[PDB]
Amino acid sequence: AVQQKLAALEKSSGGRLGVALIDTADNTQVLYRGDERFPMCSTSKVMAAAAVLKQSETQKQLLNQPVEIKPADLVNYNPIAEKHVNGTMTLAELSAAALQYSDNTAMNKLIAQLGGPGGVTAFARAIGDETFRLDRTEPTLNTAIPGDPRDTTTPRAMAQTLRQLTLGHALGETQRAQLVTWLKGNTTGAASIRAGLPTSWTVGDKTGSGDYGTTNDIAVIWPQGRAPLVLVTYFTQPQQNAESRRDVLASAARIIAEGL
Amino acid sequence: QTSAVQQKLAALEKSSGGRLGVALIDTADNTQVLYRGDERFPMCSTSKVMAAAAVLKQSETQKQLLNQPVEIKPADLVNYNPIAEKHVNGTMTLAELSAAALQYSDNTAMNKLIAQLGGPGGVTAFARAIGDETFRLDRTEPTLNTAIPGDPRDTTTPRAMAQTLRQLTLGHALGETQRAQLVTWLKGNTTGAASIRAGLPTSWTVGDKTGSGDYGTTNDIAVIWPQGRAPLVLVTYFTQPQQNAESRRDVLASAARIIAEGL
Numbered sequence: 009a010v011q012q013k014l015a016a017l018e019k020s021s022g023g024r025l026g027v028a029l030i031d032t033a034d035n036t037q038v039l040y041r042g043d044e045r046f047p048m049c050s051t052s053k054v055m056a057a058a059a060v061l062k063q064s065e066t067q068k069q070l071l072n073q074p075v076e077i078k079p080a081d082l083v084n085y086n087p088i089a090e091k092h093v094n095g096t097m098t099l100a101e102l103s104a105a106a107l108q109y110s111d112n113t114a115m116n117k118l119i120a121q122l123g124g125p126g127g128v129t130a131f132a133r134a135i136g137d138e139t140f141r142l143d144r145t146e147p148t149l150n151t152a153i154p155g156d157p158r159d160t161t162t163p164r165a166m167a168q169t170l171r172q173l174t175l176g177h178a179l180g181e182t183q184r185a186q187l188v189t190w191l192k193g194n195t196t197g198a199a200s201i202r203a204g205l206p207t208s209w210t211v212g213d214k215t216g217s218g219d220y221g222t223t224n225d226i227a228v229i230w231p232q233g234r235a236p237l238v239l240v241t242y243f244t245q246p247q248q249n250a251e252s253r254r255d256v257l258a259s260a261a262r263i264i265a266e267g268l
Numbered sequence: 269q270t271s272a273v274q275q276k277l278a279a280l281e282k283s284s285g286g287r288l289g290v291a292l293i294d295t296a297d298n299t300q301v302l303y304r305g306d307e308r309f310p311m312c313s314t315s316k317v318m319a320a321a322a323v324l325k326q327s328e329t330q331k332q333l334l335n336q337p338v339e340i341k342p343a344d345l346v347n348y349n350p351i352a353e354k355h356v357n358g359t360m361t362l363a364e365l366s367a368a369a370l371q372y373s374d375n376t377a378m379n380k381l382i383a384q385l386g387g388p389g390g391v392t393a394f395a396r397a398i399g400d401e402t403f404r405l406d407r408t409e410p411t412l413n414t415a416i417p418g419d420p421r422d423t424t425t426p427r428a429m430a431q432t433l434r435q436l437t438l439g440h441a442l443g444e445t446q447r448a449q450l451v452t453w454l455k456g457n458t459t460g461a462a463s464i465r466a467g468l469p470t471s472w473t474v475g476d477k478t479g480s481g482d483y484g485t486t487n488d489i490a491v492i493w494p495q496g497r498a499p500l501v502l503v504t505y506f507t508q509p510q511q512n513a514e515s516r517r518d519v520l521a522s523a524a525r526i527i528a529e530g531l
């Protein structure tokens with residue numbers, strides 16, 4: 009059932025669809041191009057925020073640390089940071105801005121805190137993710153060039169990591185709860201995975217988009233009366249200038265939710 | 269007269285299978301674009317803005333009001349309580365209930381705001397106090413969402429709601445602290461990305477409140493900060509002839525796109 013339906017959706021879309029579900033009720037999975045690399049775009053901000061949360065487990069006041077926001081720091085999408093130019097934001101405020109508003113200046117401050125993109129990758133390796141790689145800062149990490157492994161992961165790897173971060177023990181108890189709180193407060197997600205799910209289900213997610221019409225969402229889902237799901241939906245298209253297709257992610261989620 | 273924008277909205281409506289209401293205020297020149305601007309629509313969850321604003325108004329003469337605890341009982345839970353259900357047999361403050369009502373559209377939270385205002389008529393009284401003669405709240409959650417065609421209960425017009433949202437968020441209907449809090453809450457909405465937001469350029473900032481109900485009723489009210497220009501207020505209301513009709517957030521996105529293209 010599910011494989012035929014996801015293949016049909018992909019064919020209709022004209023693009024390349026990646027799906028990984030983990031149903032924590034029974035540890036069953038639904039994979040479609042689960043081992044192909046896709047450009048993460050803004051979904052990478054989850055790994056950067058989680059890496060700073062892990063640092064805060066041993067640097068106990070780190071999330072309170074002021075960070076200078078200079079005019080020269082502003083990049084291409086700064087809905088929160090532009091308010092604080094020529095002042096400071098804390099690492100907690102930058103983490104919330106990066107996750108809930110997808111602020112690219114905030115993401116660059118998280119990356120800088122970790123010593124550069126390699127510090128985000130190092131955290132991925134530390135929690136057993138051998139697939140994830142962050143190579144570039146914002147905004148060049150979103151070029152989404154076909155065949156380019158930079159700033160990519162696989163749906164399988166990202167679903168497994170998102171499970172460990174939000175439902176497992178990659179982070180300390182307080183830090184896991186803080187990541188889940190941030191994801192549940194996302195502002196950008198209503199057109200993506202959660203548009204394909206019953207309204208009664210609770211979703212925390214991080215969206216992204218980029219060149220090649222790249223349209224992404226990674227979610228942790230609490231269905232009414234049953235154990236949580238983790239769902240990654242990645243999508244990218246042949247034309248550099250392609251339009252976003254959040255409806256394709258919604259459709260993938262709806263197929264997944266039918267099929268259990 | 270019918271403008272280019274009104275003709276495009278008419279063509280969208282004709283293809284939609286329902287009835288579309290739009291009101292734009294461009295605060296660059298205070299001009300209005302209306303489509304069925306003086307027709308009534310069921311507000312559904314967009315009514316939560318007036319309830320939260322009424323409690324913010326109360327807080328202007330009670331510095332501690334937003335810290336006041338409210339008991340959440342098992343009997344209080346209604347049909348959509350993602351925040352309140354975590355606090356059953358405990359308390360939430362009026363700030364927590366305001367944030368839950370606006371940013372998660374918690375119906376139990378809305379009922380606590382309504383009760384703090386003395387019932388639905390307390391919300392209407394606040395609307396009258398800030399110059400809105402059109403708004404009416406008649407019922408609590410969840411019955412205020414029945415959205416029956418021709419029913420005046422729990423309705424407003426696009427024109428009235430755009431003017432009210434402007435006065436609340438950009439004007440002086442609230443104190444400056446309270447106006448800033450309302451804008452912060454709306455900008456942190458979780459439910460908006462498929463609605464007005466989906467029709468606007470990505471660089472534009474939005475705070476909004478969505479709603480849906482029966483008759484495929486699909487609503488959004490937004491304050492918009494365009495890249496390089498004064499803010500807009502936009503109301504998009506949509507309702508359909510059949511009780512069981514599907515939501516059409518795409519129609520609100522399409523209306524917003526026509527408005528943005530027409531500026």
Ligand SMILES: *C(=O)[C@](NC(=O)[C@H](C(=O)O)c1ccsc1)(OC)[C@@H]1N[C@@H](C(=O)O)C(C)(C)S1
Binds near residue numbers: 110111470
């Ligand atoms: C993350 O994906 C996001 N967008 C980008 O990274 C893109 C970029 O090149 O910087 C971008 C696409 C359109 S405008 C900028 O980071 C700013 C945010 N996530 C997108 C999404 O969820 O679809 C937004 C909300 C369009 S911006």
Ligand SMILES: *C(=O)[C@](NC(=O)[C@H](C(=O)O)c1ccsc1)(OC)[C@@H]1N[C@@H](C(=O)O)C(C)(C)S1
Binds near residue numbers: 207314373
């Ligand atoms: C407000 O509109 C909202 N939903 C309702 O009021 C509806 C009801 O009958 O209580 C409802 C429709 C589907 S489930 C409950 O209040 C809970 C929220 N706003 C809707 C929207 O924005 O489309 C939600 C997010 C579906 S729930």
